[PDB]
Amino acid sequence: TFRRLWPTIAPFKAGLIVAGVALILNAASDTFMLSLLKPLLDDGFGKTDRSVLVWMPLVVIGLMILRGITSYVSSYCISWVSGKVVMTMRRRLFGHMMGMPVSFFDKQSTGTLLSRITYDSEQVASSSSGALITVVREGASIIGLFIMMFYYSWQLSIILIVLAPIVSIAIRVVSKRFRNISKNMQNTMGQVTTSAEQMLKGHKEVLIFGGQEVETKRFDKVSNRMRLQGMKMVSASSISDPIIQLIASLALAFVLYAASFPSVMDSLTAGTITVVFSSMIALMRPLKSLTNVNAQFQRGMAACQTLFTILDSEQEKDEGKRVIERATGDVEFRNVTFTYPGRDVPALRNINLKIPAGKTVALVGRSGSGKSTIASLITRFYDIDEGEILMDGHDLREYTLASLRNQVALVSQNVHLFNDTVANNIAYARTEQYSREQIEEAARMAYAMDFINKMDNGLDTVIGENGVLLSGGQRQRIAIARALLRDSPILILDEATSALDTESERAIQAALDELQKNRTSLVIAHRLSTIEKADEIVVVEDGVIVERGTHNDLLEHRGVYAQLHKMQF
Template sequence: MIDARPEPLKVPPTGSWATYKRLLAYVKPFWFAFSLAVLGNIIYAAASTGMAAAMEYVITAIENPTDQNRLLLTGLIVGIFALRGVGTFFSQYFISYVGRQVINALRNDVFDRLMTLPSRYYDDNASGRLVSKLTFNVEQVAEASTNAITITLREGLTIVGLLGFMLYTNWKLTLVFLTVGPVIGLVVNYASKRFRRISKRIQGSMGDITHVASESISGYRVVRTFGGEDYERERFRDVSDQNLKQSLKMASTQAISVPVIQVLVAIAIAALVWTMLSPEIRGEMSTGQLIAFITAATTMAKPIRQVTSVHAKIQKGVAAAYDVFETMDEQPEEDRGEYTPERVEGHIEFDKVCFRYRDQLDNVLDGISVSVPAGQSVALVGRSGSGKSSMVSLLPRFYEYTEGDIRIDGRSLKEFSLKGLRSQIALVNQNVVLFNDTIAANIAYGALRNCSREEIREAAAKAHALEFIDRMPEGLDTMIGDNGVMLSGGQRQRLAIARALLKNAPILILDEATSALDTESERHIQEALETVMQGRTTLVIAHRLSTIEKADRILVMDKGHIVESGTHEELLAADGAYAQLHQIQFSEHA
């Protein structure tokens, strides 16, 4: 038995540097703006180093207050601060520009990949968590690719500049100051690992928050009808508390690591002051040079603190980027076929087809063989779980069958490109999906968006939808709200049928298209369905047997097998499973 599960792609390296390197690859297209940001950081670092170096001239000017020194000193102060201002603008604006561009590109890439992932991925991942990846996680990446880079470059270059100045002034004293370097490195390394670990948990808990909130909000009627408010509040508080707990762990790690590093820097400065009072180490340094050296050492405390605290942002970003890249590395739907017909005849054959869902041991469909001539309507009936919906889901290749083959006009489905195959199929579901847009945009959706106004009206008329559309305040241009909330069940269903009519595909799948409707709506829908079925190969799933009595053939399914096949009259005469189902429904209706 072949496993339907495709081979997963290799998981990207888990190392933070490998992930960060991949993230930085998104910066490449914006290298010019990034270069300007680096230039701004260099100017800022040079100005900061200049401030420390200028202390020598400040002492000289104080000791010799000549007119020239006064002019030089005031000009120096204004110049240094002006330089810092220019550097700050360049570094902050251009790195923000790069960062937002990276976020935009990343978000688009993740969404593009989500549009190509197979149905099983959506079965395994709640929609709230996927939305959280696109929103919260990608924004976390922004921190790593904007603020973190700005601070690391600006303050890192400032540290390098100040160290250079200190080495130039007195290399012996600089070595004393550098003795705490390895200890700071160990503290940063420990904090980084903890930041990354906690960040992953925070992102997971944010996904849970989005998931619980979206379920409660979208299902608010069920929640209120069944008194689920307290249960939903408890669920939300649980996931929110989990997020709070992890966020506080992150805050405590950051709050402890920063002062520890500050104390270490203070110890280094204290050791420096103690040592520089020794005549052997001080050497020939003037008072101005000594003050400039101490100023450089104390000025370095702030950039060291900022560079080490930025690790939290980088680790959050790396954890988020890893999660985002994990989605981008998911294997898309298999699409190896190249056949893209203009229009098929619509002859469908199921040849010993077996299918099981990924984590199940037993087949949902077991050896299904059936031939549906072009233009015929075939109804699938049977108890829930008999395999009806699974069978029609294989036709547009939402799932891959595990054995046997399905052919359209003698060609295997796997020879078709996915786009070519799905362009031949129209689908009307029990759960109609509508978008927060106009009625016209919902009928002429996707590849149909270039259809004329007349074609949209004609499809709506055939679907018996114009009678309510023309009563709407703006007709076809009326906005219908989230998932068509402004419309009744029957009206929504008729829009779905109008969409199928406008597509004019040779193969039509009707999955429980009338199950949730009242009798009058059902009559309208049935008339619309009879119109849409004309001249098309139609597979109909129906619970109400009264709706499929006119089908060319009825297949009765049970536990993944076809147990009976024939017309309505033939199956009633056979007095088997269909007759039994019909009798049950007839009794209930009576």
Template sequence: MNKTTNSRQLYLRLLGYVRPYWLAIVLSLLATMVLAATDPLFPALLKPMFDNGFKTGEDGWSPLAIALGIVGVFFLRGIFNFFSSYGFSWVSNRVVTDVREAMYAKMVRLPIGYFQANSSNVPLTRIAYDVNGVASAATSVVVIVIRDGLSVLGLLGWLLWLNWQLTLVCLALIPAIAIVMRTFSGRLRKASLNAQQAISSMVQVLQETAHSNRVIKVFGGEAQETTRFSGTNNQVRNQNMRQAVAAAAIGPIVHLLASFAVAIVVYVAIVQSGEGQVTVGGFVSFITALLMLLAPLRRLADVNAPLQRGLAAAESVFKLLDEREETDLGRLQLSEVRGELRFEKVSFRYPGAERSALDGVSLTLPAGQTLALVGQSGGGKSTLAALVPRFYAPDSGRILLDGHDLQDLTLASLRGHIAYVSQDILLFNDSVAANIAYGDARTRTMEEIEAAAKAANALEFIRALPQGFDTVIGENGNRLSGGQRQRLAIARAILKNAPILILDEATSALDNESERLVQEALERLMTGRTTLVIAHRLSTIESADCIAVLAGGRLVESGNHQELLASNGAYAQLHRLQFAEAT
């Protein structure tokens, strides 16, 4: 596909977002057409005035009529210019809103692998910044092309009627202008794409600075981060200047070409005037119309810059919109789940990894029991847990829930029966109540929310907050302590009341008091549920019904705490090591 075809397809796809607002577009276009039609009126008023030698009365125009005619023309232009600008601005903002919503809806449905392969700033930059260029290309460019295109046609029509020979001289410029436009289009598109990538890099630095501010301060990284930001900031400046050079060069070149035409027109008109072929009024009207023609021609020449920036933005936007969503080929929906999980020779390898994260793992977790996954880092514990809610799909083998292959279930049905609590608590910059009653549970009553908070040992500290359950907790709950955030996450899981529970290091990095409160809440949460626990501290999972030791993606051994200690295998070695460290 060549660049011209690609640009055409991009633009047609952009216009698809404009189509729902066709009525507003039509009305705005009508206003634009009327506005453009008034352009030849002013030079047309000048011709009879100069041809009659400023005569008044019966042989000439009334001075009042001429004055009112000029005011009327500009009043009419002002009215229709307002309606044209307002209409297209309304459509432009609607398009921005629609595209952003479509992009966000796509982002929340992307697979986990996308966010591992791409920095988080990539979708953020595209949604926050790139979409503005798309709107400009979809609406503003259309306004300029139609309004100024009609103005050019109207003025050219008047020029042809006045003097077709001189007008042909002006038309000879068109091929030269087309060559200039084609030359700079590619440079503008490339510079625009590079500028978007530079902005994405700058946003990434800003995100890392905001999230890692404590590390920066403690390790004295202020100067290092300032230098890093300066580098990305200058990359943005350099790419913007490349755009500016390409865009700024078009106008002067077009004006230079136009100056040749004006010079030739003046020369020929003076010669024709000496031969009686051109009247004074005709010459003044021609020159006025020709000079008025320069402004819309300049805007038409300059429209290439926002068009190329918009097409570059469109490539970025549609790249996100065309990303493949999570695969959901399942058709089975389970209304009731007992919670039995069975792993049958499950293997999985991350894209680009040298070895498998899981290699032929087989385990059975009866309904209502607890399975603890232990082992050194990189053993495959988190990967195995991530396969249960189908964040990934096994490369081989299968996972069964109550005898049903997980791949046969719809994602909504499967995940509707799973609650998840991790070490890295993810909360939202919203109220305490909204964070507990999140997602499908957002319709729960205040009494149910308070009951969940009480069961999570969170009610006391919540009531001590300034606005209680209505207190906004900040980005990722940064106004709360680690133990408080953990208990909110547990309350959220309790309120969901799902039969399957996944706990990923849910009590790590807490002080003794917080750990005690969290552990009590977890015990209440785990009661009667099928629970998959990932733990490094073996003291927290000694009561598990089954403990599975993973190493290098393989199942080394499994059994309860006493059985594994008695076998004196890998688990016993881990237990002795942690006990020695504790003493």
């Protein structure tokens, strides 16, 4: 079907061949243990007394240490190639889902996207290789049980191949007829049940009119009708199994009658009838399991398309070659509007904001404007439908994604901690380039050394989740230390932190001043210090900016930001 997957299995097909060789030896031990019923009964019990009952017990054991060694060698070699293909494809999904647009992660999929490398990726090898186990076992124990019936007694087996289909089609006809007789009876049962429901609903009408005696008499015959129509879907469902069992037993009677004729019984005996009639019983399970072998391989490969779509989806756009070494320039928004991919209401209207070099600008949007959305466009997480953002005089779309994003740091509250010791969590993606002494100086400059010195291993202690689990106040300043080390020219402050606790706010502000000393800082304003010290203030009500004026005039004249300040104070 979608078996472009095979190229990722062929490198490990040597495991599949072993697990197939050890799967026809597991199936040839199912039919070589039924074949013992011939020596057991014909030769070991009836014909004589001994000599076959002291040899066979160990052949039952020795055919179950070969059924338990080929049921494990065939479950380890289809669990090694089914684990090395759910690893060369779990690791290609993640090699894609770490270089594609945030839109996909924008709650288009959050937790189900771990179900596409943990569940819908192990259902591509727990069902596309569980449909090779049951097309080489049950499919080699069907063949294995046809060179056994036709070898012990072909005359009797060929009958069982003629009556098997007739019996099966007759049983299917009867069963479907009685599944249709019953089905059209449940319709009437539902009609009467709905009629009773039409009685319960009018409870108030029954009460007020004094009909508690008339209504209960109309249930004396609506409940006596869902009985008689309930005694007839059990007089039509319990009359099916007797009929199908009688049909099946008629074929047993016919086979036994055929064996009575001298032309069949000569080479039949009492042991060659048990290996033939007790393998067709053993031939039911294989044939039943073979039916669900294209309803698995199309279920375990239907999940190989939900993720082969992700594996070839559109990654982030790198259509640009304007790299930058250090962005020592202004940031300007020109006719910039933005809409959430997947939404029709434009999140941003006409925006014209400039961030001069070295000078910080602050945003006040306490009314849920979406100030967070403008902060995302500068880093090119999102793409703007219309407008242009010029950094150093050139639009970001011309800028290469890697270099553009290298020159900006998201210093925010909800930062993410990597499950690694906090020395690459500070020099992340640059641990090779930056020495430990530089990391120490960065932590000292941001004054973040206090949290890391108090913990156990010092600086080489795992800081990520499911580990030390440092508090939000401590988590915040690790990002400031990161920025101090990577020296991003542009700063994107969130400042959503509402924590006023001492030992948190004092150090946070101390490191914030150092970071913004000489950084073009777009701030999401919630603190008074940055509001009153920022070179430019902008208040955004919704979409377009309403007042692009500095703090003095904005505060003095009411406008909009002064109302939000009255809310502040």
